[model samples]
Target: PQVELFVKAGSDGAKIGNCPFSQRLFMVLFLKGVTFNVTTVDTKRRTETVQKLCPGGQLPFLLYGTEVHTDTNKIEEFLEAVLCPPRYPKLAALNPESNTAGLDIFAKFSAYIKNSNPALNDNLEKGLLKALKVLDNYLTSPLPEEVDETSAEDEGVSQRKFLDGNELTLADCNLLPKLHIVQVVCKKYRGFTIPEAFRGVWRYLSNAYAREEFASTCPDDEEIELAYEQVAKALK
Candidate 1:
């Protein structure tokens, strides 16, 4: 099916590789071999193209056939259910047939938000380490049978991989984009440093990043650094 997915380049959409939900959706769509075009919607002037499709005006909207879907998770499910089964031989939802894992992910995200605030008694380091520990456990432990939907046993493990495991499943795709913020914004605001306790996690992330798909998809450090610099200068 000819599908066009639109996302802002530098902001939300460019942050794709950092978020596993978005990444998983992107990978599923990519692997499914659907002919899709990634359109960069310029946020300036509230582009007519973006305004028409997404009334809320957000990145990562999928235009499939005549319908346009705004929500990423919904789009992920829609594409896999409708477009993936036939084209991709071995594909399954990340959580298989349940929303439990999705809920756990949300729980983790909420924890992150609470922990990100510097004013909190426990700030970025405490929160990031806690998050990293959860991630480490997820990646290292043997996943329950139902959660292993992608049949992702063959893929090898790495430092940079989002999930502690080896496969490039939706789990990995969902986590990385958010993790990127730890380096960029989190460090600056809350002084979250890579913890020694999470050496394995760091190693895993580092290794997973070696893949062309992951490495290339990651935003350029220099580019992001410059963006932060510019933001600082503008305020100053």
Candidate 2:
């Protein structure tokens, strides 16, 4: 049983790719504690193998034996269902179902980030702000005692540090990288930043960054910066 993860290569067609979607899967595998190999592809080139396996020239795909996994939702579902502790002793359960609170933060951020017109920036920024506000509220809310999954029981009421609560879930995996990109790209390019008033959101980021799995999977700031800059160039 071989798991080969294919992600977009960095600026040099090697190292790491800045795609948050790719990093999500990468973190999933890392947290699951699976022995997996990674392949970096220059997605811009669209090689024959890339097109054959991924028809749309998509990177961040998984090759499990003969099976191909694409799309974040599909890949997470497949991996969680197939690679479970009951099926495999060492593999851990990573995705917490129903933790969809922070699902669209990245998309909203992207809409705001990719805008070219100043007039449109206000609208896009407002949308992104709305999503962040909801997220901040979700993070502050307590996780129900009965819904615990990662480990032993809790002592008292627990705040939802991660998107799901306490432990990192698919939601956290999906959102963290995008948040990083948003934090970095927004400040550097868009002259935007996550407000300090969103303490819960900031805390949630710190919680995820503390995890070895997330820190390991996350791409560098420069990688993300470089990737987005290419797109920004076209708009200018």
Candidate 3:
């Protein structure tokens, strides 16, 4: 295929890699309705084999014809540039400006999930919760689509089905995968839970789960579990 995405594969590096970063781009491609082939680069290696394939030796690269583009952000920009508006209407919805809402989440989540020191984990959990609060409040529709649609009318409520407010955007694609990772890893390792009180965030995720784009591209839970289980052991 003309467009090939190189992403982190599973434990053996032979299977699908469970990188949220890789999946973010995967979601974008699916959302944009692009046809491409995926190549699995084992997550365990950083060697000559990868260097030849990608100059930067980065996962989640987009190889179009003979050109290789690294930098996840740049790859996203590349996709948007070529596929925006009439070429791909979905791509047009992406606005990095407003899409900036959940930017700190992954880092905070990383801090929370990776900390082995018992003294620091509580604070780390607090940090993650703070970040999630920001996102929950940013959403206009706190309920999942089903509830929002079935429940009684809102007096003056505005429904934003996605981060871009009613239109799925790059922000939605970027955040969904990370959020999934947070849900899977935190629960498994820290026994950390996203409060059911954070209705907006939960709704946002469940909505993404229901979408064909997300479902088609999202890696398996085991794909995520295997990678983190390794890191998690190191922490303990």
lDDT of the structure predicted as candidate 2: 0.76
Q: For candidate 2, give the lDDT of residue 120.
A: 84
Total clashes, candidate 2? 0
**Which scores better on lDDT, 1 or 3?**
3
Stretches off by above 4 angstroms in model 2 are 46-56, 87-98, 146-158, 233-236
Best by TM-score: 3
Q: Candidate 3: lDDT over CA atoms?
A: 0.76
For each candidate, what TM-score against the reference? 0.67, 0.83, 0.85
lDDT of each: 0.54, 0.76, 0.76
Q: What is every candidate's alpha-carbon RMSD to the true fold?
A: 6.4, 4.5, 3.9
lDDT of 1 by residue, 2-32 (tens): 6887755555534432233444456655556
- Candidate achieving higher lDDT, 1 or 2: 2
lDDT assessment of candidate 1? 0.54
In the range 1-236, model 3's lDDT, one tens digit per residue, is 38788888786767776887788888788777777877888655755756787866677788888888898989988888887687676554444444767679999988776777777877888999999988877765333433435345753233666786566678777888888888888888777779999877877787787888787776777878877886675555
Report the error of model 3 at residue 70, Å.
Answer: 0.7
